[PDB]
Amino acid sequence: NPTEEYAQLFAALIARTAKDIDVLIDSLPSEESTAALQAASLYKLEEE
Amino acid sequence: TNLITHYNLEQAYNKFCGKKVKEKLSNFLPDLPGMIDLPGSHDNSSLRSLIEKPPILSSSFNPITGTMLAGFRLHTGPLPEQCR
Amino acid sequence: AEKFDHLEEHLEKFVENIRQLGIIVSDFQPSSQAGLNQKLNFIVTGLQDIDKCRQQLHDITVPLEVFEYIDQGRNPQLYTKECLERALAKNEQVKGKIDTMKKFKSLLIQELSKVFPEDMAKYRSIRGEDHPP
Amino acid sequence: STLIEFLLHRAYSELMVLTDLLPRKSDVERKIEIVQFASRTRQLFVRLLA
Numbered sequence: 360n361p362t363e364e365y366a367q368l369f370a371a372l373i374a375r376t377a378k379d380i381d382v383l384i385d386s387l388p389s390e391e392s393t394a395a396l397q398a399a400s401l402y403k404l405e406e407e
Numbered sequence: 408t409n410l411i412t413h414y415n416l417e418q419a420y421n422k423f424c425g426k427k428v429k430e431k432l433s434n435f436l437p438d439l440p441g442m443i444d445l446p447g448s449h450d451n452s453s454l455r456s457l458i459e460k461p462p463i464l465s466s467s468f469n470p471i472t473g474t475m476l477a478g479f480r481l482h483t484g485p486l487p488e489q490c491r
Numbered sequence: 492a493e494k495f496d497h498l499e500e501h502l503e504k505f506v507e508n509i510r511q512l513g514i515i516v517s518d519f520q521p522s523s524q525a526g527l528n529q530k531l532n533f534i535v536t537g538l539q540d541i542d543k544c545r546q547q548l549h550d551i552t553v554p555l556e557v558f559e560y561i562d563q564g565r566n567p568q569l570y571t572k573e574c575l576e577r578a579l580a581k582n583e584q585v586k587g588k589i590d591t592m593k594k595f596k597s598l599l600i601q602e603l604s605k606v607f608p609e610d611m612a613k614y615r616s617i618r619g620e621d622h623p624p
Numbered sequence: 625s626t627l628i629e630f631l632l633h634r635a636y637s638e639l640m641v642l643t644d645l646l647p648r649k650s651d652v653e654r655k656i657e658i659v660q661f662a663s664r665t666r667q668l669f670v671r672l673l674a
Contacts, residue, residue: 420575431565
């Protein structure tokens with residue numbers, strides 16, 4: 360009884376973090392790998 | 408798989424299951440004559456120690472001279488501090 | 492088992508020989524004639540017979556811990572029971588651990604199957620490779 | 625086989641060692657060595673029997 364509950368909860372925690380892992384990586388704004396585009400945009404409203 | 412039956416260990420189980428077994432070696436001493444006191448001290452571990460140095464005894468036998476064994480010619484005298 | 496017995500009589504033969512020599516020397520009277528040296532001859536000749544007897548049973552191998560029980564006058568038979576309880580209990584350990592970690596395999600793989608729809612077939616392969624095929 | 629081999633020779637070797645000391649010992653003392661050696665040697669053989 361305790362072995363199954365503890366094991367099942369541990370497996371459940373994997374799913375909980377898996378959803379958090381996937382949802383958070385998909386929720387990253389500004390999907391880019393170059394700062395040049397950011398710098399041009401970061402310069403635009405600095406001028407503003 | 409039952410490893411007891413797979414490796415032919417069932418016969419051992421039927422011979423050495425829960426039964427009356429003396430904690431000492433008193434299952435063979437009574438067959439022998441005389442009063443024998445179980446010598447289970449540390450000094451009795453020689454036979455274990457005897458095996459690490461086989462060379463103490465040469466290949467076949469040590470020198471033997473039956474004629475020199477004349478010291479076993481014993482008089483008829485008493486013996487104190489010794490009980491039969 | 493014939494050789495096993497054959498060695499045994501010679502071993503007990505020597506034990507009886509020691510007692511007779513010990514009794515003869517202890518109960519020594521002039522009424523004894525040529526009865527002492529003959530007993531010693533049976534001893535020395537008895538010892539030599541054992542050397543020939545240990546070689547036909549050479550295949551027998553005595554474990555180290557077993558002779559330790561003999562040296563201290565312990566219970567070697569109890570060790571056989573101890574080993575019996577040792578194997579039976581620890582057979583549950585290997586299987587118990589296996590079953591403990593097999594159910595974690597079966598259930599967790601089933602959980603992976605219920606979270607990712609696009610990688611469903613792959614999880615079925617994990618269980619297949621998780622068996623000993 | 626090796627276990628049996630040593631005890632036979634050591635008892636033989638011990639006996640040979642004693643054979644030298646017995647002739648040059650007191651009348652009452654020579655018997656003590658034989659009785660003690662026989663009893664001690666006998667006990668060593670009981671271990672092999674078991």
